[PDB]
Amino acid sequence: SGPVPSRARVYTDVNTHRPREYWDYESHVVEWGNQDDYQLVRKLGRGKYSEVFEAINITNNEKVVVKILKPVKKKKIKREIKILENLRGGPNIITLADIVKDPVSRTPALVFEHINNTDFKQLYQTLTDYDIRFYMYEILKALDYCHSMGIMHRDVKPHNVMIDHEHRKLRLIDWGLAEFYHPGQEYNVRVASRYFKGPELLVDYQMYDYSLDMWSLGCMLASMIFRKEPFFHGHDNYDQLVRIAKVLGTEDLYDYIDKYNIELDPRFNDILGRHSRKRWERFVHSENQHLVSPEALDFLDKLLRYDHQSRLTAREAMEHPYFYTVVKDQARMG
């Protein structure tokens, strides 16, 4: 008949129950700020869809970051803008400060709050067990918030998580692949970085939901506590699922495929083969054991599940004993 349909377990109808103007980004009309407020200072990065610069707001001398977009259809730009505006003020969500027309490229440029982020090299060789729990908890706040607002990020990965370590400050950035969740909708599976793609994308199951972000987050946790980035390192999208199967096993993978009546290319089955489920303890060695605990492995195991419907939600994840010390610490009298 086709694959078995699927709905999100939580926040299923959040957009169903909001005004059309909340999620109908195509009709959103941008009001433009003034580009002459901002002077570019140095290029930070070059992407396929944008250039990113450190800049100065010359009217108050504050640093900002400017993302100058490549020419793209109005609809994709409006989607990102709408989502950033809907989510503005949410916990650990990057703040969109302004939208201007770049005077040279004549393309939209998005202006963000500046985060003095610690570079990866120093960070992931200095992070303690407590640091990892704390920052994971902060990422979960952002994901619960955006999921509760009817939005999937769909590009959760280390480089889209900015951390200012001395201020213990974290922002989830890069909302350019984000989309509104509508139950029953078939989404594009060409989202997320290869290494953080969930099984549902790798087998071309389009009716996915917020739980995609929880797989990606589980991949991030594994890479941090086992000190191997990325944890699942495939050479293409097919090989990515093979790397996952060599750890999670093929039994539970085929059970997943059976439950949703998903059809795989016969050659996919070949490369997938037959693999036993490994114990998480197999990846613990002397150089990472200080980051690993029974609580971390239990938590990890409940994120990295083939069946998207069986993964923890962000709110459930925050209730895990892994975070008891973090929660206690954040319970302040102020």
Ligand X SMILES: O=C1C=C2C[C@@]3(O)COc4c(ccc(O)c4O)C3=C2C=C1O
Binding residues: 44-52, 67
Total binding residues toward ligand X, as defined by CB under 6 A? 15
Considering only 23, 135, 137, 175, the residue that binds ligand X (CB under 6 A) is 175
114 lines the binding site for ligand X (CB under 6 A) = yes
Nearer to ligand X by Cβ, of 84 and 297: the residue is: 84
> Which residue has the closest beta carbon to ligand X?
115
Per the annotation, binding residues for ATP are 44-52, 67
Helices of type H across the chain: 20-23, 74-87, 120-123, 129-148, 199-202, 211-225, 237-248, 250-259, 266-272, 294-303, 314-318, 324-330
Q: Determine contact, residues 34/28, Cβ cutoff 8 Å.
A: no
User: Contact region for ligand X (CB under 6 A) — 12-20, 29-37, 98-106, 173-181?
Assistant: 173-181
296 lines the binding site for ligand X (CB under 6 A) = no
Residue 67's identity, in one-letter code, is K
**Rounded CA separation 246/243 (Å):** 5
Nearer to ligand X by Cβ, of 46 and 328: the residue is: 46
115 lines the binding site for ligand X (CB under 6 A) = yes
Considering only 15, 25, 67, 187, the residue that binds ligand X (CB under 6 A) is 67
Q: Tell me if residue 102 is catalytic.
A: no
Q: What tokens were used for 163? A: 């951390």
Considering only 55, 66, 93, 94, the residue that binds ligand X (CB under 6 A) is 94
Q: Pick from 68, 24, 27, 13: which is nearest to 45 by CA? A: 68
Q: List 191's β-bridge partners, or say none.
A: none
Instruction: For the CB of residue 132, give the shortest distance to ligand X in the complex, in Å.
Output: 21
176 lines the binding site for ligand X (CB under 6 A) = yes
Residues between 127 and 166 with contacts to ligand X, criterion CB under 6 A: 162
38 lines the binding site for ligand X (CB under 6 A) = no
Q: What tokens were used for 57? A: 């707001």
Instruction: For the CB of residue 208, give the shortest distance to ligand X in the complex, in Å.
Output: 22
Nearer to ligand X by Cβ, of 163 and 207: the residue is: 163
Nearer to ligand X by Cβ, of 83 and 296: the residue is: 83
Half-sphere exposure of residue 218, counting CA atoms within 13 Å on the CB side?
Answer: 28
Query: Helix, strand, coil % (nearest 5) of the chain?
Result: 40, 15, 45
DSSP 43: E
Residues between 45 and 64 with contacts to ligand X, criterion CB under 6 A: 45, 52
Nearer to ligand X by Cβ, of 93 and 296: the residue is: 93
Residue 308's identity, in one-letter code, is H
189 lines the binding site for ligand X (CB under 6 A) = no
Strands (E), 75-118: 96-101, 108-113
174 lines the binding site for ligand X (CB under 6 A) = yes
Half-sphere exposure of residue 164, counting CA atoms within 13 Å on the CB side?
Answer: 10
Catalytic, out of 13, 36, 119, 155:
155
User: Is the sign of the CA dihedral 231, 216, 92, 24 positive or negative?
Assistant: positive
Question: What does the binding site for ligand X look like in residue numbers (CB under 6 A)?
Answer: 44-45, 52, 65, 67, 94, 112, 114-115, 117, 162, 173-176
Q: Which residues are part of the catalytic machinery?
A: 155
